Amino acid sequence: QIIKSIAAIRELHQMCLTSMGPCGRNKIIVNHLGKIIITNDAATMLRELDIVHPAVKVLVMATEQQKIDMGDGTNLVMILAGELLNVSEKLISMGLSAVEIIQGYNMARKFTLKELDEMVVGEITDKNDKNELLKMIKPVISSKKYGSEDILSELVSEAVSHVLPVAQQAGEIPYFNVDSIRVVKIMGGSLSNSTVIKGMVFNREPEGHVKSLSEDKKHKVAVFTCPLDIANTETKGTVLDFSKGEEKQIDAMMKEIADMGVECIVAGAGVGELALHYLNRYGILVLKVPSKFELRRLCRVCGATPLPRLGAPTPEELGLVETVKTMEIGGDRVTVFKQEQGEISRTSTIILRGATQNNLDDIERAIDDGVAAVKGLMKPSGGKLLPGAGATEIELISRITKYGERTPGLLQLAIKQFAVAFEVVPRTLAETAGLDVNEVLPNLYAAHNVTEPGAVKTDHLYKGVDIDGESDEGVKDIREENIYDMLATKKFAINVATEAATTVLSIDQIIMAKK
């Protein structure tokens, strides 16, 4: 029965093997609403797929740990946890109980986590410079839409630097926020036409004769939750003089707002027809926000506060914005909301353009996974790094096999198989790149295993898995392209991968029903 539980995961295992890596491939999954959705991230695909096997749901819940608490490793956790079950079949055939198999991984996990502190050579100074952020952000944006990582690097690094406030010698208070960056997409244009703007861009029409305000700083903006209508009574006031009453009352309510200097009225609900006529003569910009989730993030930008009532423009609830204009994004006229210097805001927006609608979905989701790695830049090992692209996975094998003969007892069988399970990462990178399996594997071993007349290690331990398709032959230093795996992502992925395979190996029996 333990073999059948692995075969059920093996059906979805090969799908994730072709995901991770810059040469990875994407799978089409039709949503239940009749819309084709395709993406690289496995955490999104596993939610849309129907999985009736409870053993597979263990890796699904373990994948959410990579998506929520971290910004990378969703494709890595499925490959590592899937291989631990394949290498465990050799111990099951020999008659070894699942206890020593799980106990062997726990002893090997502490040996691996201890060596990860020595795998860090360089450390990020957390300067938050535009050129310095390109080192951490580039590998996270990579492995999706290969070839666009150079242009998208400048768009993400500029938006993150705007969210981070200016401070020094304080690590207690958090700064970056994930929801503070909202990405917009409009069909048309190209990738080189994208830019970075500070604010929240609105794609809705101005709805009125006023397209944009002036260039004067500190525009008064009022956010009204109640829809625009004739003034009613809080107590009862049921309507069962109606047409002429709405003309005089609404004109009187809009007059008191314009007298205080408010040039913009934000109505989260629907706007009446008679309200648009009076706002055109007073020179007040019409803005509607049907999404209530954006109103919470808007209060931190301009400073306005939502009012459940109507007709009471309290000056304490009024915000200030320097610049409100209307620009053409993707071929359509849209009102942009931004600022320049004063009233520092933590909300930024990355504008994207392109002809293909499906390609804009992955780039938008790549930014969300890209900015999520900024959260991992904090005190808990945010500056430490390790070489990726198959460089670390091969080097750790030599250290694990060294501890196999060092630790006596039955654990020698589990430690040796623990290092072999890491050979799947370089193998998938060679298969998804079109390279032969018999080529990349022996070249990586000879590069990381040499005879050096000395105690200090020399030459290069940074040799990774090259994409090839260019240059001449062999691999090259991954440091040339400034691509690496963050220690917070790699170290946390090992603990999730071991606990994911532990649950499957610990279950020797299941009871289901017809569904």
Partner 1 sequence: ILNVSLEYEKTEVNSGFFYSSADQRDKLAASERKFVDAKLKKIIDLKNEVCGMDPDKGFVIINQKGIDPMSLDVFAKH
Partner 2 sequence: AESLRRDAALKVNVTSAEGLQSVLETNLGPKGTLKMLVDGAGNIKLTKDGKVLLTEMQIQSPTAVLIAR
Closest CB to partner 2 among residues 95, 147: 95
Q: Pick one of partner 1, partner 2, none as the site partner of residue 340 (Cβ within 5 to 8 A by kind).
A: none
Residues 6+ away with beta carbon under 8 Å from 97: none
What number of CA atoms fall less than 13 Å from residue 167's CA on the CB side?
11
Region binding partner 1 by CB under 8 A among candidate stretches 53-61, 203-211, 289-297, 303-311: 303-311
Least distance (Å) between residue 94 CB and partner 2: 6
Q: How many CB atoms lie within 10 A of CB 340?
A: 9
What is the Cα–Cα distance from 472 to 265, expressed in whole angstroms?
63
What is the Cα–Cα distance from 30 to 48, expressed in whole angstroms?
8
3-state secondary structure 233-284: CCCCCCCCCHHHHHHHHHHHHHHHHHHCCEEEEEECCCECHHHHHHHHHHCC
Structure-token pair, residue 63: 């994948």
> What number of chain residues touch partner 1 (CB under 8 A)?
11
Least distance (Å) between residue 2 CB and partner 2: 12
Binding to partner 1 in span 215-234, by CB under 8 A? 231, 233-234
Q: Which residue has the tokens 């990738």?
A: 191
What is the Cα–Cα distance from 286 to 112, expressed in whole angstroms?
60
Closest CB to partner 1 among residues 255, 292: 255
Q: Pick one of partner 2, partner 1, none as the site partner of residue 35 (Cβ within 5 to 8 A by kind).
A: none
Least distance (Å) between residue 184 CB and partner 1: 32
Closest CB to partner 2 among residues 7, 355: 7
Distances (CA, A) of 213 to 206, 262, 282, 287, 405: 11, 11, 12, 12, 75
Cβ 144 vs Cβ 381: under 8 Å: no
Residues that bind partner 2 (CB under 8 A): 93-95
Distances (CA, A) of 433 to 24, 93, 279, 449, 469: 8, 33, 60, 24, 8
Cβ 290 vs Cβ 263: under 8 Å: no
Q: Pick one of partner 2, partner 1, none as the site partner of residue 260 (Cβ within 5 to 8 A by kind).
A: none
312 in contact with partner 1 (CB under 8 A): yes
What is the Cα–Cα distance from 369 to 128, expressed in whole angstroms?
18
Closest CB to partner 2 among residues 93, 131: 93
Q: Pick one of partner 2, partner 1, none as the site partner of residue 235 (Cβ within 5 to 8 A by kind).
A: partner 1
Binding to partner 1 in span 101-120, by CB under 8 A? none
Closest CB to partner 1 among residues 246, 322: 246
Q: How many CB atoms lie within 10 A of CB 334?
A: 19
Q: Pick one of partner 2, partner 1, none as the site partner of residue 311 (Cβ within 5 to 8 A by kind).
A: partner 1
Q: Pick one of partner 2, partner 1, none as the site partner of residue 236 (Cβ within 5 to 8 A by kind).
A: partner 1
Closest CB to partner 1 among residues 299, 378: 299
Q: Is 206 helix (H, G, I), strand (E, B) or coil?
A: coil
Least distance (Å) between residue 56 CB and partner 2: 24
Closest CB to partner 1 among residues 10, 255: 255
Least distance (Å) between residue 93 CB and partner 2: 5
Q: Are strands 262-267 and 181-187 parallel, antiparallel or unpaired?
A: unpaired
Closest CB to partner 1 among residues 103, 249: 249
Closest CB to partner 1 among residues 308, 454: 308
319 bridge partner residues: 221
Binding to partner 1 in span 233-262, by CB under 8 A? 233-236, 253, 256
Q: Pick one of partner 2, partner 1, none as the site partner of residue 405 (Cβ within 5 to 8 A by kind).
A: none
> If 0-12 CB within 10 Å is exposed, 13-18 middle and 19+ buried, where does residue 240 land?
exposed
The correct pick among 311, 317, 368, 383 for binding partner 1 (CB under 8 A) is 311
* Binding residues vs partner 1 (CB under 8 A): 231, 233-236, 253, 256, 309-312
